[PDB]
Amino acid sequence: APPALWDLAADKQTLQSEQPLQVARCTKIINADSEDPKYIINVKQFAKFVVDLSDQVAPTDIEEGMRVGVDRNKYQIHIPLPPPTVTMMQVEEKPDVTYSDVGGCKEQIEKLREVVETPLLHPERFVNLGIEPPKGVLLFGPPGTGKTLCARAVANRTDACFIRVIGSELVQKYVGEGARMVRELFEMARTKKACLIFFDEIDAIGGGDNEVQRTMLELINQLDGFDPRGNIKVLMATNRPDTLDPALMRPGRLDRKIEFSLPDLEGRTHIFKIHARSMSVERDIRFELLARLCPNSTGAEIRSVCTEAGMFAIRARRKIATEKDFLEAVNKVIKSYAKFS
Amino acid sequence: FLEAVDQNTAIVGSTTGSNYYVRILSTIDRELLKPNASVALHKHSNALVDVLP
Amino acid sequence: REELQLLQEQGSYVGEVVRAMDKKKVLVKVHPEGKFVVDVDKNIDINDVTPNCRVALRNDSYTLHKILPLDKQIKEIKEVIELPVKHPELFEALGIAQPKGVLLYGPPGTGKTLLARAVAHHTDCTFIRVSRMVRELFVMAREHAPSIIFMDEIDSRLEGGSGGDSEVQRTMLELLNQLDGFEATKNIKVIMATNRID
Amino acid sequence: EEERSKVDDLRGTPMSVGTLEEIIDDNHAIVSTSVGSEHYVSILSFVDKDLLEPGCSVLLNHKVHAVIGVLMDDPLVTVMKVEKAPQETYADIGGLDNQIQEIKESVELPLTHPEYYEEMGIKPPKGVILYGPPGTGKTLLAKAVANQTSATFLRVVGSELIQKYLGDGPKLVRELFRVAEEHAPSIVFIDEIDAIGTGEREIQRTMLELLNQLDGFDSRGDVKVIMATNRIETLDPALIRPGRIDRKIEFPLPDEKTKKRIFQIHTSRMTLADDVTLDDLIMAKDDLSGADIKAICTEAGLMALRERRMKVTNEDFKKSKENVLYKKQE
Amino acid sequence: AVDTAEQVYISSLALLKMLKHGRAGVPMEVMGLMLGEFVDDYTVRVIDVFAMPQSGTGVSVEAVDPVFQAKMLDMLKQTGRPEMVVGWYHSHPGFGCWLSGVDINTQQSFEALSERAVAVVVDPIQSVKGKVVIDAFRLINANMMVLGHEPRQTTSNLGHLNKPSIQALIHGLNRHYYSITINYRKNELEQKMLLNLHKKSWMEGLTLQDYSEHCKHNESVVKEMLELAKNYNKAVEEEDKMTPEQLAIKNVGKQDPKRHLEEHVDVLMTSNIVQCLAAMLDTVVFK
Ligand SMILES: [Zn+2]
DSSP: OOHHHHHHHTTSHHHHTSSTTOOOSOOOEEEEOSSSSEEEEEOTTSOEEEEEOOSSSOGGGOOTTOBBOOOSSSOOOOOBOOOOHHHHHTOOOOOOOOGGGOOSOTTHHHHHHHHHTHHHHOHHHHHHSSSSOOOOOEEESOOTTTTHHHHHHHHHOSSOOOEEEOSTTSSSSSTTHHHHHHHHHHHHHHHTTSOOEEEEOGGGTOOOOHHHHHHHHHHHHHHTSOSSOSSSOOOEEBSOSOOHHHHHHGGGTOOOEEEOOOOOHHHHHHHHHHGGGSSOBOTTSOHHHHHHTOSSOOHHHHHHHHHHHHHHHHHTTOSSBOHHHHHHHHHIIIIIHHHHO | OOEEEETTEEEEEOTTSOEEEEOOOTTSOGGGOOSSOBOOOOSSSOOOOOOBO | OOTHHHHTTTOEEOOEEEEOOTTSOEEEEOSSSOOEEEOOOTTSOSTTSOSSEEEEEESSSOOEEEEOOOHHHHHHHIIIIIHHHHOSGGGTTOOSOOOSEEEEOSOOSSSSSHHHHHHHHHHTOOOOBOOOOSSHHHHHHHHSOSSOOBOOSSOOOOOHHHHHHHHHHHHHHHHHHHHTTOOSSTTOOEEEEOOSOO | OTTTSSGGGTSSSSOEEEEEEEOOTTSBOEEEOSSOOOOOOBOOTTOOSSSSOSSSEEEEOSSSOOOOOOOOOOHHHHTTOOOSOOSOOTTSOOSOHHHHHHHHHHHSSSSSSGGGTTTTTOOOTTOOEEEOSSOTTHHHHHHHTTTTSSSOOEEEEOTHHHHSSOOOOTHHHHHHHHHHHTTOSSEEEEEOOOTTTOOHHHHHHHHHHHHHHHHOSSOOSOOEEEEEESOTTTSOGGGTTTTOOSOOOOOOOOSSHHHHHHHHHHTSSSEEOTTOOSTTHHHHOOSOOHHHHHHHHHHHHHHHHTTTOOEEOHHHHHHHHHHHHHHTTO | OOOOOOEEEEOHHHHHHHHHHHHTOOSSOOEEEEEEEOOSSSEEEEEEEEEEOOOSSOSSTTTSOHHHHHHHHHHHHTTTOOOEEEEEEEEOOSSOSOOOHHHHHHHHHHTTTOSSOEEEEEOOSSSOTTOOOOOEEEEOOGGGGSSOSOOOSOTTTHHHHTSOOOTTTTTTSOTTEEEEOEEEOOOHHHHHHHHHHHHHHTSOSSSSHHHHHHHHHTTTTHHHHHHHHHHHHHHHHHHHTTHHHHTTTTOSOOOOOOOSSHHHHHHHHHHHHHHHHHHHHHHHHHO
């Protein structure tokens, strides 16, 4: 009632303001436009309507399938309005793994580094020295320590960490949202001054499935279609090559298929070097010792070594972590788990 | 017709499924008060004149 | 002809109240695209309108109108059925501890329906038969208490089926708690029937 | 008074009950109905617009649908969590001292005793996920009860709340996520996880969406989620890597000694006779939880209490033990 | 600041023009203009009423063509119609006789010249043919909300204004929107011309033609109606044979809503046509 007091006294002008803004035709969405005067519209009640455009809304502000306010008496469009939660939910701006986690691939890290680092740092060198900067690379095959080079690519940008997109969010109820999703994230890609966009888990949208063929074939129409951009970045991550449609449509714009299986002996000590900012590691602990005392120890597996070993370091009630206290967690988490797997 | 709640007044189910509460006319006797009958009201007055066999 | 304007009202709807509100604004569940909450007319009180019941509501004013809805066997049974025939009033005077019920075990050839309906036909009283759906007939037996009730359909280790059967065992245990509990009315005499391990 | 009793024309005869969809910052919200009628009108008094929690039923009219007020209405939310502080601590049960110090050390280190948690710089705000073969709230609530001593608690028991109604979706999970957001110093406890074990096609997508929102893709370290099921084989392998990422443990078989300890705890406050033997009580049982032995301790204390005595004799505790012998065999 | 008790005079001209205009009252919005003369403050008389061509826009201020309106009004001025416009009328089918925002806006715009601005809405679509009760509408001043709403004297006729007592429109939208009473007028020329015209509309040409038709149809066609009439008479007498048993048993209360008397009285009235027309045949045969 105290909140309704000042607004109750401010309800006087609501009667003189009730005559305007009264228009509401259930916010019917349009379908297309044959000519500029007549617009074909479809209401949610499965009734297709046609009306001419009003003088208060410009014809350039009309978008295909846009929910806007429309009169229920003159049937004209008085004023538009800007308005799924997974789209804005999928926005990611967070610092993560830096370049220090190169997984032993000496040549591959340059094959992708010359396309993730150099085109942004040298825009004119690739336009004058050639015809355009390269397109991108293709990381697939065995998972192993996957998604580590994805965070490496996110933090590798010297300006601002960019958005990454997983593919497991498109297989949901009420299919068809994929079209507007990719068109509005590519529209926001046009808004972000030619920013780079990463697309993870293509296997969750590739390989009935015609309702998925709409989103993935339209996705190909939006990648091969240079309308948003045909030069920024192309990269797909999949576990199996059983996606034949992106494999046959990828030679048009995608290129440079590479592999990333496991790091080398000199790499695991560098993942430990990026874990030097993790849970407190005493100076007595040698990264080369713990790195050389565990073969087949990809960055994800040793990330789990620092996870379970971190848990046992917490359970130990100690001020700092010592290798002699969690080495049992290391060889237990790699060997007791390496027994069956 | 669905049910008769009292004398000279009853309820009647419309064709669209919605049930209507309309006072029946005094000229019609109690013979037309059959629960399972084909009653017919008016299009505007919504009053019953005679039932259909 | 004064009612002809109420004919022009295009009739009225059938309201069904599901929940009453203390602000004198009772919400009424109506036909789809309905659910119209409104204050009832002034000549009808609010507290009398009970929820979960159908009422009469007008289609425009939304005002409520009213609430809407064998010689040896007969020789041995004369003391059981022929006793409440001629002297139903002086049961309170009779202090000989009349039995509450009687059982008849054996092959139900003659005596299950012809005897009860014949001697009860001489009693000229109503004859209620049993024929979960086993409690509403017991409530009807509570309403119409003076009658001759006879088990006919039920006559045909612990387990859940013996718990569900134990609901009817509880029904007859409260028949011994009502009959043997306290005589609510004269002439309460029943006949049992059982032919198997039960 | 007159200004308070003048808006009665809007809430009078032309009044309806609609369903609001969302609230727009432009002070005109969008509502819906059985046919989904979208009308936007400037707000009026009697509304809150903050605690309204859009997506519920609101008040409409036969007019241009100016919102004159709101009407609140869910009893299932009340039975979700308990708001009391039970006296059962982590020192009232024995034998699993390591098994209880693993979860006590796991989720009692964040937000409490923070020198071993924030100085390391890890912050895995995911929590452990356990499972009790007996379950029935006894073992899983006897392990989760350690956090209930001095802290806010959040409880979720059974997947019926999703399956007892139409497929509304993960909106209830969003309600638990916003009450957990406003109640960050809490512990999320999901019990009786039998979503896929009990349309069926929507259960998989609201369960995978439960895994999506439970992962915390946009939220920082806010709450520790502890899940608890009965059978570890019912859960799909996809609910593991985005789910249980910290640690999990196994619970031993309660045949004789764990039932001897459960019997000791359930018979520590009560008074029993000298002739009450233990071997027959830990012998006649076979794969029993603590709810039935607590039930026979309750009906044994009341049955022995019928004679105005608190001592439970041996013959009366065997007479109450017949309920245990019959109940599991029925 | 002064108000009186006004009453709208309605002759058969505007009535029949609103009946033909009601027959042409298609769902599409229609337009019309009322004419008359203002003699004093509290009386208004309508004489001339015509229709307007329909438009896709409907009832609006833009649909009113001032050169067409003033052209037809000038053509009425060159003829024997020296009356100025007094108001405008239209039809509101289906959604009720109430006035929308556009109608009250064009009413507010059209009331700047005439202070009275009589408004009438005819709706014969859902109205039964038993009653042709029509109502005239008025516009209230927005500045009178502080003082009394309608300071109209002679509150006797409000009982006659209470006949449209719909529980949604009149007091469902009575705020800023009231009405006015309606009376009629009929001179002797309309009374005798229209009365004799209607009696003749129910009579014959020479008035002697269709008499012998029924007088001689009593022997050919009415005999079937007399035999069937006796079939209904006996069809009730078969129950009237059972009536003296109930009347000989209970004698208390009535349970059958059928009277069995007035229907037979009506059968006798239909049977008396033979008696009344027998003298007619006697006159035709005589002379
Ligand atoms: Zn209209």
